[PDB]
Each structure stands twice: as structure tokens, then as C-alpha cells.
Design a binder for this molecule. Structure first.
Ligand SMILES: Nc1ncnc2c1ncn2[C@@H]1O[C@H](COP(=O)(O)OP(=O)(O)NP(=O)(O)O)[C@@H](O)[C@H]1O
Ligand SMILES: [Mg+2]
Ligand SMILES: [Zn+2]
Lengths: 438, 224
């Protein structure tokens, strides 16, 4: 959104494929200025003075509780557990002998609990009342809605052993970045979901310029974004505003640096802290001391590998002992352009290509839909280094990159391996994986 | 004699055209395109021992004219952000300004986001690449006596209005923006008097202008 001062002066409003409403005569200098600020193309549309002013004004624990009404608390705890685990849909299904509940987390179904079958009608009744549905009627499908900032869509349906309930959990916030939609696998997302959910420790997202490290951090903060945690951040600059998280901007006009901004944040009694990046030792020292004094710290570095981030902390001047005790994990990340689904050409891989993995892969080609590239959009490929007992020892002993890479390959997949899986799925080309991976 | 010209923009997902021009031979020695900012390491091989000139996209830059208050030419640059404060669509403290020219009672200004310019220089410094100059891509186009010089680069139309004034606009709303144009590329299906000039590769055309001109946004705080 433009500033109100600028929009009111030149008679130009932005309302989102972004539309730019304007009043004639159009100013060419001001039109370029809007393009500069958005960093995105738009569609100019002419409008009369009276309709413009109206557009301007309108613009500016579940598991423990199961062993023990009591149903009201159970369903509320279940919904809280669903949001915790990051479930899209909650499935309550009644069979002959067994009552079963399942979440679908990032497309993958999962068994959460199988309570007593006798509770089946009570769970169906409670969920109906929350969505203003008919309690007595059990022979037809009933659909309703609830607001809890979660907007749940609930659908009942008749079955042979009663009724089957599904609750689709959707966030009303349209600017929510789903970490799985960005490209993380269910296993990578769970492991990263668990890592950022820890009470204390440093987490680093690393990669070169344009690797989507800021976008991944933002999605991580949005997932944690709760009233039970105090989340704050120092940025240079603030990429975009997340509502609920207190975002401080680095300002050289008052000598407000990353280090000085980070110190000020630590006196605000935070739970989670996010530093734009750790460029110098001064900022690194403070981030390490924050992690050892009961704060979860999140930041970034511009290293090519996940192991390079540990070496980078070593080189800046942080003592090995302090790195081992503080570091929870490193997320190496790259972006790969997704193939155009309309014009992607299949081809069988040769012997040299099969060494990396009839193996069918896909090529770029191109058409008018991609115009005329062969790719349309991007997606992330990842390598999540998890600091466990044996990694802590290797950092302390200073085993080096060579010996540390050996152990890391035994447990965590490479960034290329994650990329190659997407080539098999037909999401991106092998050329694009080999481009960004060295 | 030889130098590498690199065309960057605010969009990190967008391509980065580059070209090695030779003023000694008047020829294109090497040419290519990075897909993302993730390939900045690939520029090492093409740079070797050659000056690097960065062409920032004119879309990511404010090029405008302002009146110098009478008898305040010596203190003008300090007053520059406040005079343009109403005419830009963000906090003017964020921008880094460079005076291109001072003539009569007016001054030619070029503004760019400070953090972006610093971040671009830090990206090249991390790769061992030393950026010698930074200027708007549009101002590297040649001046024509018969009209506004134009050239298409990617899915954008570069326009140089005068010596210090310029712009870059997307194809989709290029015709609406213009409301004679000497064009150094294939003429579009748009627009308003388009004079066809001999066609050249845009990055090669820009590189020839880079060799002629002395403009640079590496001024004040950003001086080497
Ligand atoms: N997973 C993704 N899928 C599709 N587009 C993405 C993804 N991540 C980032 N992008 C886009 O690509 C651009 C680069 O992302 P960004 O998060 O700025 O990378 P970065 O590495 O943090 N940049 P920098 O801080 O300069 O190193 C942004 O403009 C995003 O809109
Ligand atoms: Mg970033
Ligand atoms: Zn296509």
C-alpha cells in the first residue's frame, strides 16, 4: 500500500495481479514512483474523481485430557493441538468397534488418537453446536462455519456407523506464508517446526542472495505467532509487516545498529528473537548470549552450505564451546524455478544422468503461458542440519568441515537430494538443480 | 579497453543480463544472463581482470528535476531530501541521492534505496567482485537529436528523455505511460511517433554508452 500522503496528492490508489486506480490527467513521474516502491508490475485503470475518494477512504494438553461439559474442553484442546501440529484438516471418523481421529498435516494423514467408541455421538453433537448445525438430524450432510484468528469449515456426513466429521482449518490472514507451499517437505517442515518451537537456542537459515531465507524466516515467525509468546525482531529493512510481531528497523540516522537494536530487544522480555543477519562478531556474541539466557534466536548467513555456517561462526570469532551449546540447527536453502506444466517435455534420463539418482524426467522447452521461458514461478529446496549429541561433540573438538560432512550425510539429506526428488516429481528440471547446487 | 557490464534490479528472482564489451575492438566479447541473484558467483569467470559496471534498473530509481533555491547552490545537497519529500512514495531518509548536474536554477537528481545499493555492493564484495561504477540503465542509452531514445530489455522499455532524465517501464502499461521516440530495437505493437534506428543488442548498446559517460551513483557515502 502506498503512503496516504502520496495517494492523496497525486490521486493514485493501489488495491489488489495488482490494480492501480488513478484520476486523469495521469502523471508519468508519479506512475514510475509507484512502480519503484512496489517492485512489481500493475494494471492502471482510469477513474472519475467521485468514485476515487470512496476507494481511498475504504482503503486507508489434548493428549493428557483424553485419558480423563468435559467434551467441550476436549474438542477445544483438539483444535489447539491441530494448530500446534500444523494440521489443515481434522478427521473424526466412526467405525464399528473403534472411534478414530486423524489430522492431515501438509497432505500426509496421521493417527493422533483412537478414543472409546461410546464417545462418538457426543463428539458429533458438540462440533455441530459450535457450527450452528442440527443436533437431532443425522441422515443428511450439514455444513457450517466457526471463528476462533482461525476460520474452521466443518462438514458432517451420514455413514454406516453414525456420522463422519471433518474440520478444515483455514487462517483468515491472506498474507500467511505456508512453509510447505513454499517448498519444504512434510519431514523437513516437521523438523523445522519442532526446532523453532524450542524454548532456547540459535537457528540459522543460510544461502546466497535470493535464496528465500527472509521468506522462510517470516513463515516460521508466522507459525509461532501466538499470544503466549512475545516475538520481536531487528531488520534492515523490514521486508513486510507481520501483525502481532513487534518489528524494529535498523536506522543509521540515530546510530541504531543490529547490535544496538538486539540489545534493546533483549530488555523487552522476549521469548523469540529474529535478527536480520549476523554480519559481525559483536552481533554474533549478543545472539549467542541470548540463546544461553533462555531466548530462541533466529537469523541468517550468506554461506553456500549448512556446515559453512558453523565454520563462519568459527571464523568470526565465536568460541567452539559456545557454538555447540547454542546452535540448534542450520537450514541451507536454494530456490529453483518450477517447470511450466503446460509445455514441459518428458524425456528418459541417460546413464550419466541416472548416476545422480525407465527414469522419466522433464525438460524446459517453453510456450505462451510461461512467455516464453519454460518455467513459471519458484519453489524452495532445503537441507536441514540438526544439531544432535554427536554434532555438539564435533564442534567442540574442531573436527573440521571434512570429518563433519561425513556424519551429516549419514542422517540428513543433501540440498541436491531434496532438489532431485522434485525433479522426479516433475516440479523442476535437473538443469535448475545443478545450477543452484555446487 | 574491456569491461563487464551487469544489469541488476530489485527483483531477486528476475534475470541478470551481463555483457563484456570491448571499446578497443568495438565488439561484444562475451554475453550471457544469470537467472537469479543466486548465480553471482558465476560472474567471477567473466570479470577476471576487468572493471565491473553495474546498471541498476531505472524502474528501481527516481530520476527527477528540482528547483535550486536562489543563492543556495553550495548547501543544496543537504536540502535535497526535504524538497523531494512530498514527491516520493516512501520515507526520504531511506534514499541515497546523487546530483548528476547543476544548470541554471535547476538540478538533475538521481535517488536510489540506500539499503538496496549497500546490499548489492555487499553481495559483489562477498564474491570478490569490485564494482567500479553504478548508474541507471536508461541513462546508458544514446542521445538522439530527433526524439526520446528507447530500447527494449527483457519485458521492459528503457527510455532516456534527456542527458540526466530517464525511465524504465513494463510492456503491459508502456503505452499508457507515454501519454517522438527513436527506437534502437524492434518496434512494438503499441503507442507516439516511433522512428526506427539500426537495431542492436540492448546490453551491447548500453555498454557503448557506459564507455562514453562518467555518471555514477557511487557518491558521498558510497564513494570508493
Ligand atoms: N519459496 C519461494 N517460492 C517462490 N518464490 C519465493 C520463495 N521464497 C522467496 N521467493 C521470492 O523470491 C524473492 C527472494 O526471496 P528473499 O526472501 O528476499 O531471499 P533472501 O535470500 O532472503 N534475500 P537476501 O536477504 O538479499 O539474501 C522474493 O521476492 C520472494 O517473493
Ligand atoms: Mg533476506
Ligand atoms: Zn509453457
Amino acid at each position: 500500500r502506498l503512503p496516504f500522503s502520496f495517494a492523496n496528492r497525486f490521486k493514485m490508489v493501489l488495491e489488489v495481479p495488482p490494480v492501480l486506480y488513478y484520476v486523469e490527467p495521469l502523471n508519468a513521474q508519479a506512475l514510475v514512483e509507484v512502480r519503484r516502491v512496489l517492485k512489481q508490475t500493475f494494471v492502471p485503470q482510469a477513474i472519475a474523481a467521485e468514485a476515487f475518494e470512496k476507494k481511498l477512504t475504504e482503503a486507508y494438553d489434548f493428549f493428557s485430557l483424553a485419558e480423563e461439559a468435559p467434551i467441550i474442553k476436549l474438542i477445544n484442546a483438539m483444535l489447539g493441538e491441530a494448530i500446534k501440529e500444523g494440521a489443515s484438516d481434522i478427521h473424526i471418523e466412526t467405525f464399528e468397534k473403534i472411534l478414530s481421529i486423524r489430522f492431515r498435516v501438509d497432505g500426509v494423514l496421521r493417527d493422533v488418537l483412537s478414543p472409546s467408541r461410546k464417545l462418538a455421538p457426543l463428539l458429533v453433537s458438540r462440533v455441530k453446536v459450535m457450527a450452528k448445525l442440527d443436533i437431532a438430524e443425522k441422515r443428511v450432510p450439514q455444513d457450517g462455519r466457526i471463528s476462533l484468528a482461525v476460520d474452521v469449515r466443518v462438514s458432517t456426513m451420514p455413514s454406516s456407523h453414525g456420522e463422519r466429521v471433518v474440520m478444515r482449518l483455514l487462517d483468515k490472514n491472506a498474507t500467511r506464508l505456508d512453509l510447505h507451499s513454499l517448498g519444504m517437505t512434510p519431514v523437513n517442515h516437521d523438523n523445522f517446526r519442532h526446532l523453532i518451537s524450542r524454548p532456547h537456542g540459535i537457528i540459522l537459515v543460510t544461502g546466497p542472495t535470493g535464496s528465500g531465507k527472509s521468506t522462510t524466516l517470516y513463515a516460521g515467525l508466522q507459525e509461532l505467532n501466538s499470544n503466549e509468546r512475545n516475538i520481536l525482531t531487528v531488520e534492515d529493512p523490514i521486508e513486510f509487516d507481520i501483525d502481532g510481531i513487534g518489528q524494529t528497523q535498523v536506522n543509521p540516522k540515530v546510530d541504531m545498529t543490529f547490535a544496538r537494536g538486539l540489545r534493546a530487544i533483549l530488555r523487552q522480555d522476549p521469548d523469540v528473537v529474529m535478527v536480520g543477519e549476523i554480519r559481525d562478531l559483536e552481533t554474533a556474541q549478543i545472539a549467542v548470549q541470548a540463546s544461553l539466557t533462555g531466548h530462541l534466536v533466529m537469523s541468517t548467513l550468506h554461506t553456500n552450505t549448512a556446515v559453512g555456517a558453523i565454520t563462519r561462526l568459527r571464523d568470526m570469532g565465536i568460541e567452539p564451546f559456545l557454538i555447540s551449546s547454542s546452535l540448534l540447527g542450520v537450514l541451507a536453502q536454494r530456490l529453483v524455478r518450477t517447470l511450466c506444466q503446460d509445455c514441459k517435455e518428458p524425456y528418459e534420463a541417460d546413464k550419466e544422468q541416472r548416476k545422480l539418482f525407465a527414469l522419466t524426467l522433464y525438460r524446459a522447452k517453453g510456450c505462451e503461458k510461461c512467455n516464453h521461458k519454460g518455467y513459471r514461478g519458484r519453489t524452495g529446496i532445503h537441507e536441514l542440519l540438526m544439531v544432535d549429541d554427536k554434532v555438539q561433540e564435533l564442534i567442540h573438538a574442531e573436527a573440521g568441515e571434512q570429518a563433519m560432512d561425513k556424519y551429516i550425510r549419514e542422517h540428513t539429506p543433501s540440498i541436491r537430494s531434496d532438489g532431485l526428488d522434485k525433479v522426479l516429481q516433475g516440479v523442476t528440471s535437473l538443469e535448475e538443480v545443478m545450477r543452484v547446487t555446487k | 579497453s574491456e569491461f563487464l557490464t551487469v544489469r541488476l534490479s530489485s527483483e531477486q528472482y528476475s534475470p541478470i543480463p551481463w555483457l563484456v564489451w570491448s571499446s578497443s575492438q568495438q565488439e561484444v566479447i562475451a554475453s550471457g544472463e544469470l537467472s537469479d541473484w543466486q548465480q553471482l558467483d558465476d560472474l567471477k569467470n567473466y570479470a577476471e581482470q576487468r572493471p565491473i559496471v553495474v546498471l541498476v534498473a531505472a524502474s528501481d530509481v527516481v530520476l527527477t528535476e528540482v528547483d535550486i533555491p536562489p543563492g543556495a547552490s553550495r548547501q543544496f545537497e543537504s536540502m535535497l531530501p526535504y524538497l523531494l519529500e512530498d514527491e516520493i512514495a516512501q520515507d526520504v531518509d531511506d534514499l541515497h541521492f546523487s546530483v548528476l548536474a547543476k544548470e541554471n536554477g535547476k538540478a538533475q537528481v538521481c535517488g536510489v534505496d540506500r539499503r538496496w545499493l549497500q546490499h548489492m555492493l555487499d553481495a559483489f564484495r562477498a564474491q570478490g567482485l569490485d564494482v567500479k561504477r553504478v548508474l541507471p540503465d536508461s541513462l546508458a542509452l544514446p542521445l538522439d537529436d530527433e526524439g526520446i531514445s528507447a530500447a527494449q530489455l527483457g519485458e521492459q522499455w528503457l527510455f532516456r528523455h534527456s542527458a540526466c532524465q530517464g525511465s524504465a517501464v513494463d510492456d503491459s502499461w508502456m503505452p499508457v505511460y507515454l501519454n517522438s521516440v527513436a527506437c534502437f530495437s524492434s518496434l512494438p505493437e503499441q503507442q507516439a511517433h516511433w522512428l526506427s534506428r539500426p537495431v542492436e543488442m540492448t546490453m551491447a548498446l548500453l555498454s557503448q554508452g557506459v564507455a562514453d559517460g562518467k555518471f555514477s551513483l557511487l557518491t558521498g557515502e558510497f564513494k570508493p
